[PDB]
């Protein structure tokens, strides 16, 4: 009722902005970047477990993925120290 | 069979990197950024069409959201001209 | 100020349920479904605009995408009819 | 440029559906359901930690909330046993 297309734009925006207005407001944003030949930690861990003999289990395939990052043979896409499976990586020099 | 834990680390990585290695790759990644009080264009459009009388179809609500961006009352999170429902937005100076 | 871990649980819940309690309460919910090989309308238009010659502008790619939905070559994941770039689709029968 | 507006529609779609076509695809989707008076598990835990006395930290608030689901005071909107902060709930019989 109380707001319509005749209300000034600035006031409608302040209404949408006020606490408890109804608007979904969260403390994050997801941006899509086009980086050819990237991959997830989980895809590296998979590939090593299934293609490289001698791992007693998957957690050792994950430690090996981790040493590849330390060695700079894969690289983080934004600056991070520690390996995670959920993060995206690209290849180092080679 | 031909790769195991005894193999050269760099050689194992160059095999993973080759064409047709089986390594799941693709050309896009998603980054999460912590922006306080950010919101989706689609939710702005949901809020308007739900709370502001005078819109005959949802498209007039999207066009109004477009006008809010032109006016600087909402703002893009990254350098972009035109409005989209899939992008993330913050409020301007109010 | 005067609710604590010693208060009646049902009374706490009631306090949180009252008007103006400050709990975020809203007429919506969002659900994650696992659907292998699902794609967004906007990615279909993008694919068609970049790979199929003869689209003078991007809106013509959109209308073609709508004509895929209408012919059943792609399918909405819920009960809708009209094409939207924001919804998720899957492939129809292609055998 | 082997495909145009002249090509068979079914053949264009089979192209798009082929391994390595370039079409961006995913194994998850998000759906909006209109449900009156629904709230996020993390919003309940926040509301408890801020307005109820005697929680030395946030994990004790999370546990109380999980207790609230067990007693039937809040309820899951999809059949799930256990409590989780990213799932949606409604009020029970009050």
From Swiss-Prot, chains A, B, D:
Protein's cellular compartments: Cell membrane; Cytoplasm, Cytosol; Cytoplasmic vesicle; Nucleus
Disulfide bonds: none
Occurrences of domain DEP (ranges): 19-93
Signal peptide: none
Post-translational modification: Phosphorylated by CSNK1D. WNT3A induces DVL2 phosphorylation by CSNK1E and MARK kinases.
Quaternary structure and interacting proteins, as annotated: Interacts through its PDZ domain with the C-terminal regions of VANGL1 and VANGL2. Interacts with Rac. Interacts with ARRB1; the interaction is enhanced by phosphorylation of DVL1. Can form large oligomers (via DIX domain). Interacts (via DIX domain) with DIXDC1 (via DIX domain). Interacts (via DEP domain) with AP2M1 and the AP-2 complex. Interacts with DACT1 and FAM105B/otulin. Interacts with DCDC2. Interacts (when phosphorylated) with FOXK1 and FOXK2; the interaction induces DVL2 nuclear translocation. Interacts with MAPK15. Interacts with PKD1 (via extracellular domain).
Domain notes: The DIX domain mediates homooligomerization.
Function: Plays a role in the signal transduction pathways mediated by multiple Wnt genes. Participates both in canonical and non-canonical Wnt signaling by binding to the cytoplasmic C-terminus of frizzled family members and transducing the Wnt signal to down-stream effectors. Promotes internalization and degradation of frizzled proteins upon Wnt signaling.
Family (UniProt): Belongs to the DSH family.
Protein's UniProt name: Segment polarity protein dishevelled homolog DVL-2
Species of provenance: Homo sapiens (Human)
């Amino acid at each position: 009722s109380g707001l319509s297309v005749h209300t000034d734009m600035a006031s409608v925006t302040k209404a949408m902005a006020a606490p408890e207005s109804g608007l979904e407001v969260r403390d994050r944003m997801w941006l899509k970047i086009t980086i050819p030949n990237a991959f997830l930690g989980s895809d590296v861990v998979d590939w090593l477990y299934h293609h490289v003999e001698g791992f007693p289990e998957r957690r050792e395939a994950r430690k090996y993925a981790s040493g590849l990052l330390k060695a700079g043979l894969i690289r983080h896409t934004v600056n991070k120290i520690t390996f995670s499976e959920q993060c995206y990586y690209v290849f180092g020099d080679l």
